[PDB]
Amino acid sequence: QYPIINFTTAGATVQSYTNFIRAVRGRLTTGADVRHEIPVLPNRVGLPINQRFILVELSNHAELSVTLALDVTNAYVVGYRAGNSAYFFHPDNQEDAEAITHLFTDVQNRYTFAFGGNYDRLEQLAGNLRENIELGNGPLEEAISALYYYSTGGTQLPTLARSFIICIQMISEAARFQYIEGEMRTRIRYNRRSAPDPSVITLENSWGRLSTAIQESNQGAFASPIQLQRRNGSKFSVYDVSILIPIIALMVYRCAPPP
């Protein structure tokens, strides 16, 4: 039985959301590997299956619940349970395929989607880009109802897909980036929904390369700058880990730390 973190969108506040994201980060990171002050997720090679996943149970105002499964090695949502069913994104390799058989083993109906959980795929299934999909407490409340009603046949795949896109950003991307967590906190604080601005999208698209650049840096200095975007869409270059310390909360393992 993997660790479970609970969050309800009903009556959510900045504080309850922050506590939630902080608990998710705390279960993702064994805290073993920090580099330039940024924790790195556990290396997949050698991590025991019994420690591979965490469970995120989400409940809403309609009193419905779904439970997402996150891979601790990269904070990826690999599937979810609703009622007496579990559903998984198509696995990226036999290793991962094997790992997931350990999830939601007590459910009656397990389906593995033929599609993976990548954004491009979800955006196609949803018929919309991330920049056109609103994020916030309302959208997350509705996403939970949509995931739940899929198990009963009342949710179409476009809606299911748009609902994954909302969950993945408000949970996994916010766990990865304090900056995205901050954008979601602001939405909650003013009870507003709005699509993510370019700064959020470009960070999301740059997690792996930021992770590598930091882990391969020379004393924190990048050999090659990485271009990110401001909230207004203009570009700016990152040359050093220092300005990312307040931005990125977790990195994926890309290389062993040097002696």
Both 2 and 98 in one domain: the answer is yes
Is 37 flagged in the annotation as binding? no
**Position of tokens 């900056």?**
179
Is 26 flagged in the annotation as binding? no
- Residue type for position 54: I
Task: Please tell me the total number of residues recorded for the chain in this structure.
Answer: 259
Both 189 and 258 in one domain: the answer is yes
Which one, of 236, 145, 231, lies nearest residue 182 by Cα? 231
**Per the structure block, which two tokens stand in for 8?**
């309800």
What is the resolution of the experimental data for this entry, in Å? 2.0
Is 220 flagged in the annotation as binding? no
What technique determined this structure? X-ray
Both 26 and 136 in one domain: the answer is yes
Both 2 and 16 in one domain: the answer is yes
Catalytic residue IDs: 76, 119, 173, 176
The enclosing domain of 200 has a CATH number of 4.10.470.10
Range of the domain at 250: 176-259
Both 114 and 186 in one domain: the answer is no
Q: In angstroms, rounded to a whole number, what is the distance separating the alpha carbons of residues 80 and 254?
A: 27
Is 210 flagged in the annotation as binding? no
Q: In angstroms, rounded to a whole number, what is the distance separating the alpha carbons of residues 66 and 56?
A: 8
Q: In angstroms, rounded to a whole number, what is the distance separating the alpha carbons of residues 254 and 157?
A: 33
Is 192 flagged in the annotation as binding? yes
